[PDB]
Each structure stands twice: as C-alpha cells, then as structure tokens.
Amino acid sequence: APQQINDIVHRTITPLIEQQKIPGMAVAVIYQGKPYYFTWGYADIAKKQPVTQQTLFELGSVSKTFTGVLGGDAIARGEIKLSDPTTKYWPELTAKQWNGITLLHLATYTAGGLPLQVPDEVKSSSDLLRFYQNWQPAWAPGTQRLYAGSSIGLFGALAVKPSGLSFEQAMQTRVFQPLKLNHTWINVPPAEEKNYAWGYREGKAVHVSPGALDAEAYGVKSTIEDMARWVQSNLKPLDINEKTLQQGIQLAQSRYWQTGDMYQGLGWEMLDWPVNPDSIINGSDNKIALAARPVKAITPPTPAVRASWVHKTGATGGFGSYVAFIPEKELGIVMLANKNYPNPARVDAAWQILNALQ
C-alpha cells in the first residue's frame, strides 16, 4: 500500500540529500502503473525557487535511453539496420579502421575504443569528420565495450539521416509526442525557462554547455513527471499504440553483449533480477563503469527479459540523474538532482527503495 512507499522513500532520500549536500531533488516511484512524486529543496538557490513536479533537470547520459529508443524506432521503421556499416550513412568516413564498424557497434560502445567524450576542440562538422577519421582504435570491432558518448552520439546522428529530419525533430515527433512527454526538451523554450533548475558545481550555478553531438548523447532536459512516464513506457511497451515505437522500446532492452553480470541494450543496461546489490552499486562507480571490458556477443540478441533490473546513470557538471526499473514487477524509480554526486549513492538509494517494494 502507498504507506510503504512514503516511508521507504522519506527514510532513504532525506539522509542522502543531507549526506551529499544536494540543493534540490525530485524522485518518482512507479508502482503498479501509478507514479508517486517527492520533491525537496531549491531549483534556484539564489532566487529561492523550489523544486516542483514541473522543474526541469538535465538528464546527462540518461538521454542515451531516448537515443537508444529513437534508434530502435528507426530500426522498426526499416530506415536503418544495426547490421549496417557506419559507412553506409557517412561515406566520408573512408579511413580503414571504419571497415567493419556497424551501427550496432556504435550504439553499444563496442566499435573498438571511441572515447568517453567528443573532444572540446570539435566545433564544426568538418572538425567532427577529422576526429573520427584520425581516431585510432585499441581493439577490433565487437570485442571490447568502452562506455562512450562519442560512440552512441554518432549512432544517434546517423540513425536519423534516412528520415530526413534533424535529430531533435525526430526525437520530438517520434518519441516525445507519442508518449505525451510534453515537458521534455532538447532545447528549452522560453515558456519553460522559469522551470529550468540550475545545476550546482562547487557552489556555482551552471547549465550544460553546447557541444558536438550533445543532442544525441546528453541532450535531454525533463521533469519528474515526464520521466515517470518515460519509465512507465519502458516498463510496459505493449500499452504504446505507435507500433514502431513499441517495437523500438523493446529493441532497446534486447541483450546484445554481456560483460560480467551486465548486458548492454541500446542506451539501457540490464542485469538479471534479483541482482546482487553490491554489484550494481560498486559497478556504478566511474572507475569501474568507464573501464574497457571484453564483451561476449549474444548471437542472436536475447529479447527483453522481464525479470531484469534495467537502468542508466547520468550526469552533467551540475546534475546527477538515475533511472531504474524492473519490468516483471511493474516497479521503477527516477532520481533527479541538481548536483552531480557519486553514482554508487544513487544506486544504493534506488535499490533500497525498489527492493523494499518488490
């Protein structure tokens, strides 16, 4: 019953905010098809603007879930295949290392060591091309997983090319609108500026900066309500009336690669439920999560497994986000904060809450 929810959430999150000195935070728990919302603190400290259910947070790397699903939808539409070579979409990518790198590799960080970020010196499309052309792999395609915004980013930009739409147009018309995420943005419009929290880094108020392939890797700003709706859409894709979008959501939770007890989806990462909590909490530390690891191909990919812990962490310089959910149990959580605090604290809090509700 809802008292269970309130009790575990309050007991769990109030110490976390105190320990991590989080200025503002929004949490949603999704339980049996219903969301339950909790907010604390300030969206803007200087102006004493409180966090509310309409406050926008930067998702950072959680945006990659949207990118994964938008790709999944382009696959379902027959516009692209994950088996296609990158060069089919960017024929200017002629350097020899691109021979053998597929869209699957890009989408799943397995191209052979594309880096965590696109370098800050890349400001133009010619700078981008030069970057990928000069890039030297460390491993053969499909052999090591190295978590990389420059990999999934490129996938995003390539995956929308056949549509004829920009990445933002594709995401708005094919994902945001059908799911009725009407307070979810890649570019925040004037009507929402008042709701857009500041991030806090070493005490300074900050917003994410423009960057190459930002829309694709870390584009999205959203509210706790819309994120709870994103979680629900991903927990229960069969309720989605748009067929290609339903299928895309399912494709993003297919298991493509395994490393240790983790399975790579498109954006999403997955473990079998029940999980070992120490494995996901410690696994979330950047020392571990950003390290290169050999992967085993799952040939062919396993379709979305209901008994999974499905999750993704995200950060910008000012923001820390986490989404997890367990489809078999109709259970999930969203944690949005306007400080970047360590991932294991997010994941530990989330597990404490969801495990209690299972």
The pattern of x and - marking residues 262 through 281 that bind ligand 1S7 according to CB under 6 A reads --------------------
The smaller minimum CB distance to ligand 1S7, of residues 29 and 215, is found at 215
Candidates 312, 268, 227; CA nearest to 37 is 227
Candidates 19, 56, 8; CA nearest to 336 is 56
Q: How far is the CB of 1 from ligand 1S7 (least distance, A)?
A: 35
Q: How far apart are alpha carbons 301 and 113 in whole angstroms?
A: 22
- Asked if the bond preceding 91 is cis, omega within 30° of 0, the reply is no
Q: How far apart are alpha carbons 354 and 352 in whole angstroms?
A: 6
Give the one residue of 71, 149, 283, 327 binding ligand 1S7; rule: CB under 6 A.
149
Q: Tokens at residue 28, please?
A: 């949603």
Phi and psi torsions of 153, nearest 5°: -55, -50
With CB under 6 A as the rule, give the number of residues binding ligand 1S7: 13
Q: How far is the CB of 302 from ligand 1S7 (least distance, A)?
A: 25
The smaller minimum CB distance to ligand 1S7, of residues 64 and 174, is found at 64
The smaller minimum CB distance to ligand 1S7, of residues 101 and 206, is found at 206
Query: Is residue 233 classed as helix, strand or coil in its secondary structure?
Result: helix
Give the one residue of 11, 19, 94, 116 binding ligand 1S7; rule: CB under 6 A.
116
Q: Are 319 and 199 in contact (CB under 8 A)?
A: yes
b/e code 97-107 from CB counts within 10 Å (16+ = b)? bbebbbbbbbb
Of the candidate spans 34-42, 263-271, 291-299, 311-319, the one that interacts with ligand 1S7 by CB under 6 A turns out to be: 311-319
Give the one residue of 104, 217, 331, 336 binding ligand 1S7; rule: CB under 6 A.
217
Of the candidate spans 7-15, 72-80, 99-107, 312-320, the one that interacts with ligand 1S7 by CB under 6 A turns out to be: 312-320
- 61 catalytically annotated: yes
For position 317 contacting ligand 1S7 by CB under 6 A, the verdict is yes
Of the candidate spans 45-53, 86-94, 295-303, 315-323, the one that interacts with ligand 1S7 by CB under 6 A turns out to be: 315-323
Q: How far apart are alpha carbons 36 and 219 in whole angstroms?
A: 26
Of the candidate spans 1-9, 123-131, 243-251, 314-322, the one that interacts with ligand 1S7 by CB under 6 A turns out to be: 314-322
Q: How far is the CB of 344 from ligand 1S7 (least distance, A)?
A: 13
For position 200 contacting ligand 1S7 by CB under 6 A, the verdict is no
> Given the DSSP bridges, would you call strands 262-264 and 49-50 parallel, antiparallel or unpaired?
unpaired
Q: Could you tell me the CA-to-CA distances from 353 to 68, 224, 251, 277, 309 in Å, in that order?
A: 26, 17, 27, 12, 13
Give the one residue of 108, 144, 184, 316 binding ligand 1S7; rule: CB under 6 A.
316
Give the one residue of 61, 195, 222, 264 binding ligand 1S7; rule: CB under 6 A.
61
Tell me which residue has tokens 């409180």.
50
For position 212 contacting ligand 1S7 by CB under 6 A, the verdict is no
How many CB atoms lie under 10 A from the CB of residue 287? Answer: 7
Residues in contact with ligand 1S7 by CB under 6 A are: 60-61, 116-117, 149, 208, 217-218, 286, 314-317
Catalytic residues: 61
